[PDB]
């Protein structure tokens, strides 16, 4: 069996327990769940207006899942240095260790400062993730479906950038499932696709196109953490790691 221990050959005299730093630093690091709630960078983008957007059009939409977005190094010419360098993170690294999850997420999107415009944020529980490809932030183009616009029923919230430019969130668990998939997802069942993302958040500015020019190529970093109610389930061993200090130097 895996955790069996046939015949211990103890040499150690007993070492003092430290309580995971409780005896030194004053804080236990035993529960890995409480570390999971330190916020992590989730995605990152430079806003890119394409079509002449109206008040209603979403500026970008991303699926919201604990697994972490499929990692986006960026194009070879313009890397997002943190994901290029600081690969993945903590929460996805532990999400690597389990096979199912059932819980909330929190986000705290940090909008660009220079813009003044109001910002709405839909949550869309309906949407199915459609394979691990296109599990990434998407800059929506011309409206053609209801995907591109504000919608009435979906839960939403509207930060006033002028007052404070970081809307904070609580994406809830709405799925008709026991508990969702947690590793990378290739979609076998067609109904397996409802079994991953908590929803499909959509951020959108209310700016008219005359003012939208200020917004172009302004950064919008995003954060996430597992939201207290989260509970990963089945243990599954780690897929091979790739040591970071061993990554190649830029070379002068």
């Amino acid at each position: 069996e895996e955790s069996r221990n046939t015949t211990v050959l103890d040499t150690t005299t007993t070492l003092q327990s430290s309580g995971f730093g409780r005896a030194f630093f004053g804080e236990a690091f035993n529960d890995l769940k409480t570390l999971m709630r330190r916020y992590q960078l989730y995605g990152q983008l430079l806003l890119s207006v394409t079509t002449d957007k109206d008040i209603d059009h979403c500026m970008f939409t991303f699926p919201c899942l604990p697994q972490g977005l499929a990692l986006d190094i960026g194009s070879a010419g313009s890397p997002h240095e943190i994901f290029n360098r600081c690969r993945d993170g903590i929460i996805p690294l532990i999400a690597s260790g389990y096979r199912f999850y059932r819980g909330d997420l929190r986000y705290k999107i940090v909008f660009p400062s220079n813009v003044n415009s109001n910002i709405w944020v839909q949550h869309r529980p309906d949407r199915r993730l459609e394979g691990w490809s296109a599990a990434k932030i998407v800059n929506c183009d011309a409206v053609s479906t209801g995907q591109g616009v504000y919608n009435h029923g979906y839960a939403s919230h509207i930060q006033i950038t002028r007052v404070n430019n970081v809307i904070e969130l609580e994406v809830p668990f709405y799925n008709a499932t026991c508990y969702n998939y947690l590793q990378a997802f290739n979609a076998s069942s067609a109904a397996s696709s409802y079994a991953v993302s908590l929803g499909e958040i959509s951020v959108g500015f209310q700016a008219t196109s005359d003012d939208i020019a200020s917004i172009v190529n302004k950064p919008v970093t995003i954060y996430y953490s597992i939201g207290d109610g989260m509970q990963f389930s089945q243990w599954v061993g780690y897929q091979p790691m790739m040591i970071l200090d061993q990554l190649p130097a830029p070379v002068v």
Binding site: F24, F25, A28, T34, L35
Partner: protein
């Protein structure tokens, strides 16, 4: 959702907590510590001899 129609408190903003004060005065912070109740501790052999 009862509505809360009564008048709001009327406070005056300041940008910064006092720099001068340093005694009988709780001073709120954005701790970079993980636990919010954590505080540095001194193991019995690391105790501060000098007052």
């Amino acid at each position: 959702n009862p509505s809360y129609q009564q008048s709001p408190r009327h406070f005056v903003p300041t940008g910064m907590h006092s720099l001068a004060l340093g005694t009988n005065l709780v001073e709120p912070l954005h701790a970079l510590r993980l636990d919010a109740a954590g505080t540095t501790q001194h193991p019995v052999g690391c105790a501060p001899d000098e007052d």
